[PDB]
Amino acid sequence: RIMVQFLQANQESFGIMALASAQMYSSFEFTCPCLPDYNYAYGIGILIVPPIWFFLLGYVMNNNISVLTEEWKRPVGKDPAVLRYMFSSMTQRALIAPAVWIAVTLMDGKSFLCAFSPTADLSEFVNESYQSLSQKELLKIQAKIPCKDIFEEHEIISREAATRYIRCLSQACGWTFLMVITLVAFLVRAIRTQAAFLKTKYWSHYIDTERKLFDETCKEHAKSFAKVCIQQ
Amino acid sequence: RIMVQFLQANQESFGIMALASAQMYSSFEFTCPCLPDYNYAYGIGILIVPPIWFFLLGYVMNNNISVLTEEWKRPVGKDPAVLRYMFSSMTQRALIAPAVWIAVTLMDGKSFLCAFSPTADLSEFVNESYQSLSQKELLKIQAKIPCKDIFEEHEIISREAATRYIRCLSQACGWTFLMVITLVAFLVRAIRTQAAFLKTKYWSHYIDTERKLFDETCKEHAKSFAKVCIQQ
Amino acid sequence: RIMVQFLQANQESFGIMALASAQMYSSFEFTCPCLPDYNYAYGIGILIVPPIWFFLLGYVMNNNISVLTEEWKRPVGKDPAVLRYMFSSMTQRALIAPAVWIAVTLMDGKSFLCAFSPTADLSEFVNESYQSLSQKELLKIQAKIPCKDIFEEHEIISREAATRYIRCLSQACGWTFLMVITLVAFLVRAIRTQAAFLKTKYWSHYIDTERKLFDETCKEHAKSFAKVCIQQ
Amino acid sequence: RIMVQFLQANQESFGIMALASAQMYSSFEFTCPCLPDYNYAYGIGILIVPPIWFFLLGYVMNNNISVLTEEWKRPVGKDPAVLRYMFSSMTQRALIAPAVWIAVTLMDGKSFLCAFSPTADLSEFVNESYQSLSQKELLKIQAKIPCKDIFEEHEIISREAATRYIRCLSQACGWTFLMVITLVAFLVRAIRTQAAFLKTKYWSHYIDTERKLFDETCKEHAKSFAKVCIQQ
Amino acid sequence: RIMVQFLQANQESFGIMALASAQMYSSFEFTCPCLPDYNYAYGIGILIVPPIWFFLLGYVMNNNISVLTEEWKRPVGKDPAVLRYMFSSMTQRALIAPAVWIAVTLMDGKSFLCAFSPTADLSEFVNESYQSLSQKELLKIQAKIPCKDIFEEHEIISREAATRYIRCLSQACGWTFLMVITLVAFLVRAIRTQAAFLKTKYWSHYIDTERKLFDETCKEHAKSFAKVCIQQ
Amino acid sequence: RIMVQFLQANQESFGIMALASAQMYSSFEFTCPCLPDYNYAYGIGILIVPPIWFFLLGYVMNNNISVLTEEWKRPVGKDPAVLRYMFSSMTQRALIAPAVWIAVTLMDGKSFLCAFSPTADLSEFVNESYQSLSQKELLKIQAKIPCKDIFEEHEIISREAATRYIRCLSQACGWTFLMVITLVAFLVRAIRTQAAFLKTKYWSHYIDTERKLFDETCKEHAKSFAKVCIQQ
Amino acid sequence: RIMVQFLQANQESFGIMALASAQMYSSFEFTCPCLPDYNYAYGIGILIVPPIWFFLLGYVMNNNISVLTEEWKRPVGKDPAVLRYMFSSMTQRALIAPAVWIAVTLMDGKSFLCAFSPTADLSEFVNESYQSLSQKELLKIQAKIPCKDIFEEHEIISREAATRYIRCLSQACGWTFLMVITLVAFLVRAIRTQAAFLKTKYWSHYIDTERKLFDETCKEHAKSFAKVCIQQ
Amino acid sequence: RIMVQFLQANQESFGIMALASAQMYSSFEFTCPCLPDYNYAYGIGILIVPPIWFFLLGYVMNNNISVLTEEWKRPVGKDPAVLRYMFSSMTQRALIAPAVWIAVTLMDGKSFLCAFSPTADLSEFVNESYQSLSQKELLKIQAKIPCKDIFEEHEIISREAATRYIRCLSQACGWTFLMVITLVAFLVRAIRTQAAFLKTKYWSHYIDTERKLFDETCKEHAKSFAKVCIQQ
Ligand SMILES: *[C@@H]1O[C@H](CO)[C@@H](O)[C@H](O)[C@H]1NC(C)=O
Ligand SMILES: *[C@@H]1O[C@H](CO)[C@@H](O)[C@H](O)[C@H]1NC(C)=O
Ligand SMILES: *[C@@H]1O[C@H](CO)[C@@H](O)[C@H](O)[C@H]1NC(C)=O
Ligand SMILES: *[C@@H]1O[C@H](CO)[C@@H](O)[C@H](O)[C@H]1NC(C)=O
Ligand SMILES: *[C@@H]1O[C@H](CO)[C@@H](O)[C@H](O)[C@H]1NC(C)=O
Ligand SMILES: *[C@@H]1O[C@H](CO)[C@@H](O)[C@H](O)[C@H]1NC(C)=O
Ligand SMILES: *[C@@H]1O[C@H](CO)[C@@H](O)[C@H](O)[C@H]1NC(C)=O
Ligand SMILES: *[C@@H]1O[C@H](CO)[C@@H](O)[C@H](O)[C@H]1NC(C)=O
């Protein structure tokens, strides 16, 4: 409920793909398979592949990827640097949604709990009676931890006690990730290109004005033949 | 509830047929027949035929299919190319809603669960007591899995344990589909036609201006006889 | 609740009679009589007569049925064609609400369940104990199926198991109907009349301009006598 | 709850007296007396007298009933025809709310259930044990049917089974009424008066312009004496 | 809850005192004293005195009662007729809220139930065992009827059975009152004064224009001395 | 809940201090001390001192009390009459909120119940067993009546039966108060001063115009030195 | 819930710091320590230090404290009086929020209950059995009174009976405080400085005009060099 | 719920990073690990590192950090003081969100409770029976205090009694922090730079005007070649 609450708060306070990723996470039915073989795969996949898809999507939604591939494809493109600058700007704009997804899914330690439960060392939580049993038997039990309606072995492991531990580890990792990302962003904004920016601004203005003028002249050239044919 | 939540979030953030398909799924009463003979048929049908209907509908709602069939029907149409371009644009605009429907119904593994439950290999979930019994007897039991109010054989198969497994497989398939679709869209937007676009823009502007001029001249030609007849 | 949800979604997204029929269905208290003699009649009636009433209503709400009957009544009407075109347009606009009603009431298999329950062949659901009894005794029991608060014979037939079966059949029929209707609409929009359209547009513009001019000249002719009489 | 839902839907979609009657029904506490002597009277009264009051009210709210009675009262009124046309238009506008009330109260078979329960033939619902008893004893029991908190004789008659039967009959009668009304409206709009309409339009415009001119000239004639007296 | 629902519906659809009286009733804590001596007094008082207060209030809120008493007080007032017309108009505008209050409190048979319960003849509801006991003992019991939390003698009288009876009588009286009021309003609007209306319109326009001119000339006469004193 | 409901209704329908007092009452935690010594004091205090504070507050919020005390303080004030008129107008505007508070707190008989419970004569409610006991013992019991969670002596006095009685008395007193206040307001508006009103209107317009002119001339006199100093 | 209700009512009716303090109180988790040593300290602290912080905050948020300290710091400031007037106005504007906080926290007798419970004389509430025991033992019990989930000694002291008593005392103190504050405000507004007000108004207008002129001239002086450098 | 309530109140009343930090806290799932080794670390981390990240973020979001690092990097920057002033202004604007976070997380004593529970001296709460046991055994029990669903040793320590104590200490620390911060802010606003402010204002206006002029001249220079190329 906290995720939906912050979603509504972000909507009220309200570049846009961030809210898209947040909403998609808050409305995605995370279901851990709760099996010793697919737990790790499912957790790491939910952690890894959605940001990759968001990266690709952010590249696709960009309106000027066509000019980029056109210039990269030609031997001598009609300058040499606005291309690198435009590509860097596109990549930087696209990298936002994956980072938001990773941060959200780490602060909410569901993927971490699903992925690292079967193999983690939970020895302070395992009951004192069954403190000597094969780790192969512990594998299934620990894998069933992230499932409330499946874990029916409270006599061996306290579920909430290990859930809180793993979730705290996940939140620590999330805050570390956020700090590193913010430091990198600070360095980037403090270091980084002057002529390329002006050239790109000019080319964008030129494209817009050309499109508008083309629409206008098409309308004017159509009005004449319209008056000609209608009078028939 | 997550589907309706993301529906409301999409409505708040808000080409339109995507929201139409999402809403239609979130408000469609999926009822698995829970029978070994019609489970597969019903699941695959819900997966397959609604996107076909959405494709046809998107073709019908298009305002310029009439000109397409008129030109395809004539021996020598009044150019050759803008037709192929217009048809490709129509098809690309129409293909959006089916993809959204398939993605949604795969992320929510209801159709997958209904379709693949009776024949899947659920051997780690079947109880150890009835681990040796005819697969024909297992057919009905496994078919009854997606039905909460019908599956009354908890002593043979854990329902939730297999539900999570099949739903995880469905979500994996959904993410794979999304990745492939995004890659194809990236390639299409990066590869693909210059004169046809301008010709289509000009023809659209001409049609609009002609319609507006016709309305205007009809009003002007009517005003005279109106003043003539009213004075009687 | 799904019907009301999609009603609200359609209202938010928002020719109008479609929403009218959807709302009327979502707010109509469908009560199956649950009797072997009136079940079929009630179900088929709810399926058939409301779309007929919607058809008639859509014909009545049309603002230019009077001109149609005036021209059809005269021996020589003041052209021949715009009449057929206007009538076809009226019929096509009117046929929308009945189709929406039928589609909605088929996707929600209440009418189908009420109509086909007493006579359908439910042999896989009838308990194995009373698997040999007179179909006349089965008539009342099966007729009582669509009534939750009346069906008190769970020892003979599983209610939900047959409800899901009949509802799935109804949804299949609904999707078939939708596909056929969409194909017919595609063919109609792709095949079908050029002069009649322009003539109808001109006549509509003429009628509107004449009405407006009549209002204006009435006001002007009234102002004089108003100034005359007020000064008394 | 369905009536209030459709009330809100009609409000959202939104001549006005229709919504007034619908709201008044949805907010009127229908209380069947549940007595063999007053059941019929109360049901038929709720069915009959509210539409009569709505008819009278619609006549009263009409702004030009005074001119109608003034002309009907004079020996030679200052034309002959616009009176009949104005009266017919008033009656047609007024007849809307009673029809809406009757349709609503028939689709919701409360009045029908209250009125026809004590005397209807409910022989398939009366228990097999007391299948031979004086109809005078059955009178009170059947009269108590529409009262949930009063009918405490479930061992003699199944309440819901007869409630559904009578409600289905009421809904059939309601749909029949709607069909007949729609057919009559279609015939009226298709048959029916040309000069009277123009005369009424002109007289209405004249009245409006005269009122506006009178207000203006009153203000102008007052301004002079205002400037005269204020300066004192 | 029905009263508040219709209150909200009236607010949504939305001379104003009608809504005021409706709201005041829907938010007034009607508490029957449930005593054989004060029941009648309290019921009749709630029925009678609030409309009297509403009448007085509607007279007070009227902006031109001062001119009425000024002219009625003078021996020779500065015409004779517009006074009677203005007074009749004031009374007619004021009489709306009391009628609405009476209609509402009669349709909701609380006052009727509180007032007429102790003395009404409820012989078909009194149990057959205590069918022979002093009416003085029946007085207290019947008086306690409108109180749910006080009436603890279900073995002598069925509370709901008599509540429905008295409430039905109250609703009948309410509909009769509404019909009579509507008939009287129809007769009044059909019968009833020509010069007085114009004179009142002119006097109102004159008063308004004089007030506006006085404000304007006060501002103009103040501006001069303002410019004079500010410069000091 | 009725008080908050009417608060919301008044807010929707919406001199302002009336709503302020209503809101303050609906959001004030009335806690009867339920002791034989402080009950009367607390009830009468809640009845008396909040209207006094509202009176004082309404006097303070008035924007022209300073001119009143300035003129009352001087031996010869710069006319004699507009002072009495302004003071009367201020007092009349201020007297609204106390009356609203008293009316509200009387219609909701909480203060009356808290104040008059310990000493009232409740002899028809005291049980027949303890009908002969010292009034000093009855004092505490009756004082505990307005407290639901404290009154634990149901065997001696029926709590609700006396609560309804006292609340009915309170509502009677409230309606009497409202009637008397409305009669007094009618007499005041019908009796009551002509030159003083015009003088006050003129002085108010003069004050407003002087303030506006002073602001304007301050801005103009500042602009010059602004242009002078900025250029440095 | 009453505090939040009045918060919403104040928001709907809606110098601003008053609502800030009200909201901060309604959303502050008051937790009495329920210990004989820290109860008094915590209660008095919640009563005393938040208004001090609000006073300081209101001083800080004031936009012209800098000019005040600048003039107070100089030996001969560039007049003598507007400083005292500006300081008095600042203090009066700042004193609003602390008074609102104190009034709110006194009307809601939580701080009073927490502070005065351990040492108050509650002898009419202590049970008759333990009416002779060391006050040191009574200290802990009485201190635990404001805690619902901690006070588990109902056999010695009735919790609600003393809670109501102390809360009534707190409300009395709150009303006394409000009356005294209103009287002081009345005296202040009736007594209190003519030239200082005009001087402050003029200085404020001058500051505003100077700021606006400076922005304008900065823009104009920048435009020239902008046109100069851009053309390079 | 109080935090979300004040969040909504702040949103309604509504430099922006304050609301961001408040929302992020109200929607952050604080999960104390409830272990004697990681409790302190987790609590202090939640207290310390989020404000550091907010500080860095506020530095990054600042639009003119690039000019700061450009001037700090050059040997002789194109003045010497607007840099120090701009840096101080940036730091002061950035320091807001960390302070809000610390204040919020201290008023809501969750971090304090998680951090200081295992080592605090809770001797008045430990039961009298186990008042002599190794502090190593008390370590785990006290560490489990902030966990409602884990602390299952009510026979040794009263959970709520110590929770209230530690939360009161946390609130005291929070109010102390707020007072110190407000005093420092008062001193800063009262002490602190005249030429630097004007220079920064001028440079900002110059930058804005230059950007706008550059956009304009780019559009004008593009229009010519647009008209040139379109005509081809
Ligand atoms: C540990 O196991 C014993 C029996 O083996 C059981 O009684 C006890 O409740 C268990 N405790 C926990 C914490 O699992
Ligand atoms: C397996 O079956 C046995 C009896 O056959 C039953 O006692 C046990 O609960 C079952 N377990 C599961 C997981 O189905
Ligand atoms: C079938 O009938 C038997 C007795 O005739 C009963 O025990 C059993 O529960 C019934 N089963 C079903 C599925 O109706
Ligand atoms: C019919 O009456 C018998 C006894 O007379 C009773 O046992 C049975 O439940 C009743 N059945 C119905 C349907 O009323
Ligand atoms: C009538 O009274 C008898 C005993 O006097 C009791 O058993 C019965 O339930 C009562 N019935 C009603 C309807 O009050
Ligand atoms: C009156 O008191 C008797 C015993 O003294 C008790 O049984 C009875 O219930 C009481 N009745 C009321 C109405 O208090
Ligand atoms: C007073 O104490 C006695 C026993 O000491 C107990 O029975 C009684 O309920 C108590 N009463 C109150 C009001 O505490
Ligand atoms: C203290 O411990 C005793 C037994 O050791 C137990 O009976 C009692 O309830 C405990 N009390 C508290 C307050 O923990």
Q: Quick check: D217 contacting E, CB < 8 Å?
A: no
Q: Is any atom of ligand 4 closer than 6 Å to the C-beta of D124?
A: no
What is the number of helices (H) and of strands (E) in chain C?
Answer: 10, 0
Distance CA G102, CA G48 (A): 8
Separation of CA F133 and ligand 6 centre (Å) = 15
Q: Which runs of consecutive H residues, i.e. helices, occur in C27-64?
A: 39-60
Do residues C168 and C199 both lie within one domain? no
Do residues G220 and G154 both lie within one domain? no
Residue type at E157 in one-letter notation? I
CA A107-A111-A115 angle, 5° bins: 135
Angle of helix E39-60 versus helix E96-107 axis, rounded to 10: 150
Question: Hey, how many other C-beta atoms are within 10 angstroms of the C-beta on C76?
Answer: 6
Question: Counting atoms of ligand 1 from 1, which one is nearest the CA of A128?
Answer: 1
Distance CA D160, CA D125 (A): 10
Q: Is any atom of ligand 1 closer than 6 Å to the C-beta of A13?
A: no
Distance CA C39, CA C33 (A): 6
Do residues H115 and H179 both lie within one domain? yes
Give the H/E segment covering residue D26: helix D17-26
Chains touching H (at least 3 CB pairs under 8 A) are A, G
Q: Quick check: A202 contacting H, CB < 8 Å?
A: yes
Give the H/E segment covering residue G117: none
Do residues B138 and B89 both lie within one domain? yes
Distance CA H149, CA H152 (A): 8
Q: Which ligand sits closest to the CA of A158?
A: 1
- Is residue C83 within 8 A of residue C74, CB to CB? The reply is no
Q: Quick check: D5 contacting C, CB < 8 Å?
A: yes
Ligand 8: residues with CB < 6 A are H 127, 129, 155
Distance CA G223, CA G210 (A): 20
Do residues C108 and C179 both lie within one domain? yes
Which among C47, E108, C23, C31 has a CA at the least distance from the CA of D22?
C23
> Taking CA atoms, what residue in D is nearest to E214?
D230
At what resolution in Å was this solved?
Answer: 3.1
Do residues B226 and B186 both lie within one domain? no
User: Longest C-alpha distance within chain B, in Å?
Assistant: 99
Number of domains in chain H: 2
Q: Which residues touch E11 (CB under 8 Å, ≥6 apart)?
A: E19, F9, F12, F13
Q: Is any atom of ligand 7 closer than 6 Å to the C-beta of G127?
A: yes
Residues 60-99 of D with CB under 8 A from E: 60, 65-66, 69
Distance of CA D81 to the CA centre of its chain: 29
Distance CA A191, CA D85 (A): 85
Question: What is the C-alpha R_g of chain B?
Answer: 27
Separation of CA F132 and ligand 6 centre (Å) = 14
Pocket test of ligand 4: the residue of D127, D152, D157 to mutate, having most ligand atoms within 8 Å of its CB, is D127
Domain enclosing residue C160, as ranges? 2-193
Distance CA F202, CA E214 (A): 9
Residues from chain C contacting residue D182 (CB–CB below 8 Å): 53, 56-57, 60
- Is residue G161 within 8 A of residue F150, CB to CB? The reply is yes
Site of tokens 């003043």: B227
Do residues F132 and F206 both lie within one domain? no
Distance CA A140, CA H204 (A): 64
Q: Name the residue facing C60 among D13, D124, D185 (closest C-beta).
A: D185
E-strand ranges in chain B read none
Distance CA A227, CA B217 (A): 9
Tell me whether residues H150 and A158 touch, CB distance under 8 A: yes
Do residues C224 and C168 both lie within one domain? no
Question: Counting atoms of ligand 4 from 1, which one is nearest the CA of D156?
Answer: 14
Q: Which ligand sits closest to the CA of D159?
A: 4
DSSP A81: S
Residues 144-183 of E with CB under 8 A from D: 158, 160-161, 164-165, 167-168, 171-172, 175, 178-179, 182-183
DSSP characters over chain E: -HHHHHHHHHHHH---HHHHHHHHHHTS-------TTTHHHHHHHHHHHHHHHHHHHHHHT-TTHHHHHHHHHSSS----HHHHHHHHHHHHHHTHHHHHHHHHHHHSTHHHHHHHTTTS---SSB-STT-SS-HHHHHHHHHTTT-TTT---TTTB-HHHHHHHHHHHHHHHHHHHHHHHHHHHHHHHHH---HHHHHHHHHHHHHHHHHHHHHHHHHHHHHHHHHHHHT-
Task: Assign 3-state DSSP to chain C and report helix, strand, coil percentages, each to 5.
Answer: 70, 0, 30
Tell me whether residues D175 and C50 touch, CB distance under 8 A: yes
Separation of CA D155 and ligand 4 centre (Å) = 5
Distance CA B8, CA B6 (A): 5
Do residues C186 and C202 both lie within one domain? no
For D157, phi then psi, to 5°, come to: -140, 130
Atom 4 (ligand 4) nearest CA: D129
Pocket test of ligand 5: the residue of E122, E124, E125, E127 to mutate, having most ligand atoms within 8 Å of its CB, is E127
Q: Quick check: H2 contacting G, CB < 8 Å?
A: yes
Chains touching D (at least 3 CB pairs under 8 A) are C, E
Question: Hey, how many other C-beta atoms are within 10 angstroms of the C-beta on F8?
Answer: 17
Do residues H178 and H200 both lie within one domain? no
Give the H/E segment covering residue B37: none
Distance CA A107, CA A114 (A): 14
CA F7-F11-F15 angle, 5° bins: 100
Question: Hey, how many other C-beta atoms are within 10 angstroms of the C-beta on H83?
Answer: 16
Whether G contacts F, i.e. 3 or more CB pairs less than 8 A apart, is yes
Pocket test of ligand 6: the residue of F124, F127, F151 to mutate, having most ligand atoms within 8 Å of its CB, is F127
Q: Name the residue facing E209 among D11, D69, D223 (closest C-beta).
A: D223
- Is residue D81 within 8 A of residue D199, CB to CB? The reply is yes
Which among G97, G91, G83, G114 has a CA at the least distance from the CA of G196?
G83
Distance CA A27, CA A8 (A): 13
Pocket test of ligand 2: the residue of B122, B126, B127 to mutate, having most ligand atoms within 8 Å of its CB, is B127
Tell me whether residues H27 and A13 touch, CB distance under 8 A: no
Residues from chain D contacting residue E9 (CB–CB below 8 Å): 7, 11, 23, 26-27
Do residues F79 and F183 both lie within one domain? yes
Distance CA B56, CA B19 (A): 17
Q: Quick check: E4 contacting F, CB < 8 Å?
A: yes
In three-state secondary structure terms, A157 is strand
Tell me whether residues A182 and H56 touch, CB distance under 8 A: yes
| Interface test mutation site (partner C, options B57, B218, B221, max chain C beta carbons within 10 A) | B218
Tell me whether residues B53 and C171 touch, CB distance under 8 A: no
Residues 12-31 of A with CB under 8 A from B: 16, 19-20, 23-24, 26-29, 31
Distance CA F102, CA F54 (A): 11
- Is residue H171 within 8 A of residue H109, CB to CB? The reply is yes
For D23, phi then psi, to 5°, come to: -60, -45
Q: Is any atom of ligand 6 closer than 6 Å to the C-beta of F155?
A: yes
Q: Name the residue facing A33 among B165, B191, B198 (closest C-beta).
A: B165
Distance CA B219, CA C201 (A): 10
Q: Name the residue facing D218 among E172, E205, E214 (closest C-beta).
A: E205
Sign of CA dihedral B140, B142, B146, B150: positive
Q: Quick check: C2 contacting B, CB < 8 Å?
A: yes
Separation of CA C156 and ligand 3 centre (Å) = 7
Residue D157 pairs in a beta bridge with D126
> Taking CA atoms, what residue in D is nearest to E200?
D218
CA A209-A211-A213 angle, 5° bins: 65
Q: Quick check: D191 contacting E, CB < 8 Å?
A: no
Do residues A186 and A199 both lie within one domain? no
DSSP B33: -
